[PDB]
Amino acid sequence: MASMERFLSVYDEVQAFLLDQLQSKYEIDPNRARYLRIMMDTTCLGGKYFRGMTVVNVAEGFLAVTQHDEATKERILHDACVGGWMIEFLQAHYLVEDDIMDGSVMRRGKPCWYRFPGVTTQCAINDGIILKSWTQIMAWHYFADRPFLKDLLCLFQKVDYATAVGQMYDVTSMCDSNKLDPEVAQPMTTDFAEFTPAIYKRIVKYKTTFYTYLLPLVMGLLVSEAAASVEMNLVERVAHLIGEYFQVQDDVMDCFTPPEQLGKVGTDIEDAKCSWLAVTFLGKANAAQVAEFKANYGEKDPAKVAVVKRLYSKANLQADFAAYEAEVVREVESLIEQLKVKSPTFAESVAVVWEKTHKR
Amino acid sequence: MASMERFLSVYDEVQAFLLDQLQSKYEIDPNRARYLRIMMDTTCLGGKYFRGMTVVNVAEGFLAVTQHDEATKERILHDACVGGWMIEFLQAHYLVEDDIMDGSVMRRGKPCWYRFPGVTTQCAINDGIILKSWTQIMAWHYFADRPFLKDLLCLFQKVDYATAVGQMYDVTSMCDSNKLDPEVAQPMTTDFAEFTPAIYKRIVKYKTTFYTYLLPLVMGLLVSEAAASVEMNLVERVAHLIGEYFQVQDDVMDCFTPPEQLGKVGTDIEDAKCSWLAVTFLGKANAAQVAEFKANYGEKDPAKVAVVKRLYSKANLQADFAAYEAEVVREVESLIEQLKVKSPTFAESVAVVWEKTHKR
Numbered sequence: 001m002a003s004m005e006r007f008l009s010v011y012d013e014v015q016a017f018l019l020d021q022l023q024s025k026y027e028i029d030p031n032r033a034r035y036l037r038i039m040m041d042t043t044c045l046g047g048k049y050f051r052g053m054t055v056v057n058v059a060e061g062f063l064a065v066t067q068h069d070e071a072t073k074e075r076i077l078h079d080a081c082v083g084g085w086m087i088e089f090l091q092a093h094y095l096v097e098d099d100i101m102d103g104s105v106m107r108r109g110k111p112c113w114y115r116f117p118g119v120t121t122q123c124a125i126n127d128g129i130i131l132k133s134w135t136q137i138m139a140w141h142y143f144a145d146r147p148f149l150k151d152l153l154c155l156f157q158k159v160d161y162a163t164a165v166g167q168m169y170d171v172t173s174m175c176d177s178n179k180l181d182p183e184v185a186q187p188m189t190t191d192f193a194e195f196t197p198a199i200y201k202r203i204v205k206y207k208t209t210f211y212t213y214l215l216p217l218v219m220g221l222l223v224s225e226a227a228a229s230v231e232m233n234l235v236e237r238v239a240h241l242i243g244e245y246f247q248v249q250d251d252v253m254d255c256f257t258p259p260e261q262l263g264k265v266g267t268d269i270e271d272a273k274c275s276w277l278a279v280t281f282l283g284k285a286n287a288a289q290v291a292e293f294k295a296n297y298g299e300k301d302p303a304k305v306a307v308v309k310r311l312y313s314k315a316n317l318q319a320d321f322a323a324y325e326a327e328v329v330r331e332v333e334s335l336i337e338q339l340k341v342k343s344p345t346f347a348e349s350v351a352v353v354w355e356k357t358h359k360r
Numbered sequence: 361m362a363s364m365e366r367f368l369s370v371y372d373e374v375q376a377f378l379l380d381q382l383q384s385k386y387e388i389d390p391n392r393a394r395y396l397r398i399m400m401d402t403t404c405l406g407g408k409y410f411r412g413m414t415v416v417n418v419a420e421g422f423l424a425v426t427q428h429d430e431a432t433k434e435r436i437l438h439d440a441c442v443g444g445w446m447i448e449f450l451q452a453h454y455l456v457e458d459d460i461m462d463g464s465v466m467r468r469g470k471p472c473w474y475r476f477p478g479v480t481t482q483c484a485i486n487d488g489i490i491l492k493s494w495t496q497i498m499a500w501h502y503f504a505d506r507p508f509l510k511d512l513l514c515l516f517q518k519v520d521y522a523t524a525v526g527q528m529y530d531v532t533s534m535c536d537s538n539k540l541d542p543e544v545a546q547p548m549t550t551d552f553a554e555f556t557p558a559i560y561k562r563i564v565k566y567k568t569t570f571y572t573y574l575l576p577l578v579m580g581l582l583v584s585e586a587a588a589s590v591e592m593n594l595v596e597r598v599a600h601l602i603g604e605y606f607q608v609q610d611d612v613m614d615c616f617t618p619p620e621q622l623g624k625v626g627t628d629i630e631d632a633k634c635s636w637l638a639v640t641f642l643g644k645a646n647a648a649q650v651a652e653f654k655a656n657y658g659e660k661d662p663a664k665v666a667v668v669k670r671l672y673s674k675a676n677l678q679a680d681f682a683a684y685e686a687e688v689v690r691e692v693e694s695l696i697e698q699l700k701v702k703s704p705t706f707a708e709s710v711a712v713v714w715e716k717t718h719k720r
């Protein structure tokens with residue numbers, strides 16, 4: 001069976017399971033079950049399934065070099081699909097909540113969930129809670145007797161928690177640290193002293209790389225019982241590197257990709273986000289460029305946003321990006337090589353993850 | 361050592377642990393650690409700690425009848441305190457999110473977290489995420505080698521999930537079920553056909569009773585390794601009964617308790633909530649009373665809210681409440697008795713839970 005149709009089939013199975021359970025054990029009525037079915041479909045489906053499919057691809061890699069009964073191959077691939085859906089639903093939780101937090105309009109060319117007319121924020125905040133709760137229900141049901149259950153649940157929590165901490169680093173990225181204070185409304189930075197590579201890297205490492213790259217890779221290893229085929233520090237290092245690159249591309253596209261192609265009107269400039277473009281621009285600007293950037297950044301006014309875009313275009317940030325891209329190619333290839341000392345197969349899965357990231 | 365000072369001491373310990381961990385493993389800076397410290401204190405502290413202290417009281421009960429080394433008594437009480445804080449932090453997560461969902465103003469005579477000037481909804485939604493994530497971090501750290509870890513984490517998830525499903529039942533309680541639909545803005549019910557005792561009971565069972573009563577009782581049993589001293593169906597039945605009673609009192613107080621004493625301006629009438637008062641009023645009203653109630657319920661207009669209050673006062677709902685209260689006294693005493701077949705101690709803890717509920 002091809003991997004993607006397996007993966008999509010298991011979505012239907014897990015949906016049925018969750019909704020059947022709500023009816024037998026949580027007293028749900030058919031109309032609220034329908035509401036939850038629609039919510040799940042709307043929030044979990046229509047992406048590329050990169051994260052969840054990575055769990056399946058890692059597991060397929062190991063299957064090709066490990067002796068197993070056919071039933072065992074099937075069980076492992078079914079666990080990989082379940083595990084992939086936990087990651088997709090964890091993503092779904094964060095997109096629902098982040099779109100409410102950020103007052104976002106669209107996502108993927110469709111309205112954010114909370115903006116649907118029969119949803120509203122009141123329900124959507126709790127729908128997003130449910131999305132994440134479903135990841136646990138899946139796990140406890142499908143993995144109750146599995147030897148990797150403990151390790152999988154402990155990994156998943158950590159990644160969830162890293163993610164939430166990353167969200168805090170992101171939403172507070174335009175504030176001056178020494179001014180954080182629940183009692184006092186937070187001004188935007190005026191010096192941009194915290195728009196540094198190291199501070200950027202911290203935001204991205206926690207907000208994206210743990211759930212997007214580390215967790216799919218390591219879930220593949222756990223459902224395969226293959227964590228001893230790898231040096232976990234190397235898996236972490238490569239995940240964080242690749243994940244950083246992924247976000248740098250997202251940052252660049254928020255600004256320069258046509259909204260119809262983006263799926264989204266990009267607002268990083270108005271939102272005063274600590275983007276790769278802002279940081280890299282500040283890393284090369286002269287005094288006058290820095291002052292013009294300060295006078296225009298983090299303002300809804302379209303005349304000012306267009307000044308920030310003009311500054312970025314004039315500053316030749318494509319040069320810095322190809323330099324960055326070169327260095328990431330270097331380091332990711334070094335790490336892949338180090339990953340072959342213990343697992344050629346695993347290193348090859350990492351290669352494929354890198355290729356899918358480095359092209360899109 | 362007295363139970364409450366133990367419990368409060370363990371709060372400080374767990375706080376220190378969480379913030380120290382953020383610094384050593386999650387790259388946090390001191391100012392964001394301070395923000396999280398303040399958030400934790402503001403959201404987790406200043407209640408009565410009923411839920412978390414119930415875990416400690418159940419555990420104390422078992423200690424008084426079970427032979428153990430002093431070090432083991434200390435370990436059990438420390439686990440009970442940790443477990444109690446997981447419940448308090450789970451509550452904190454739901455109050456933060458529910459206050460944002462409901463557009464609430466105050467809670468306990470202080471502003472809702474999201475309304476603090478340096479917080480805002482953008483941060484508060486994610487602060488509430490973190491609150492719940494901290495419950496898992498506590499568990500994995502303090503209970504990593506404990507034999508009850510699996511059972512505790514599986515119970516906790518279920519209770520979390522019941523809670524979220526209860527929140528969905530509550531936020532959708534004024535809608536007609538057959539009209540739920542993400543695509544279509546939801547009208548308030550005009551017939552109130554779903555304002556029934558059974559429908560009310562379902563809302564309350566899931567939204568409150570699992571986290572408020574079931575989880576503290578069963579956590580006490582798990583940290584005591586005492587789940588075999590009870591018939592779990594009886595613990596569930598008693599939890600749900602007592603929990604229902606608790607919410608009926610909250611419902612009555614939302615309407616009739618002075619806001620300065622309530623901690624809150626009560627808005628259940630304006631919010632068109634399926635409250636015990638609404639249901640019980642509809643269960644006894646004549647046609648004219650039902651029509652006046654329909655013309656006035658679920659409106660912000662203070663003239664209409666005062667009409668709904670007048671209808672409730674005229675309808676002598678105190679009578680129905682003392683009748684309800686009588687029946688709950690009957691059934692809770694029956695269940696306590698059934699709980700003595702297997703554990704006098706456990707039954708006595710349930711008695712104390714009932715006494716603290718039935719007086720406040």
Ligand SMILES: CN1Cc2cc(F)ccc2NCCC1=O
Pocket residue numbers: 155157158159160162210214385386
């Ligand atoms: C717990 N902590 C952060 C972390 C979070 C995760 F999600 C996954 C891995 C790691 N490990 C790196 C450092 C550490 O020990």
Ligand SMILES: CN1Cc2cc(F)ccc2NCCC1=O
Pocket residue numbers: 025026515517518519520522570574
């Ligand atoms: C899982 N489900 C609902 C439930 C949720 C909980 F939080 C705790 C207990 C129960 N048990 C009653 C019925 C059932 O088996």
Ligand SMILES: [Zn+2]
Pocket residue numbers: 098099101102170
């Ligand atoms: Zn965001």
Ligand SMILES: [Zn+2]
Pocket residue numbers: 250251254
């Ligand atoms: Zn972006």
Ligand SMILES: [Zn+2]
Pocket residue numbers: 458459461462530
């Ligand atoms: Zn609410």
Ligand SMILES: [Zn+2]
Pocket residue numbers: 610611614
């Ligand atoms: Zn209330």
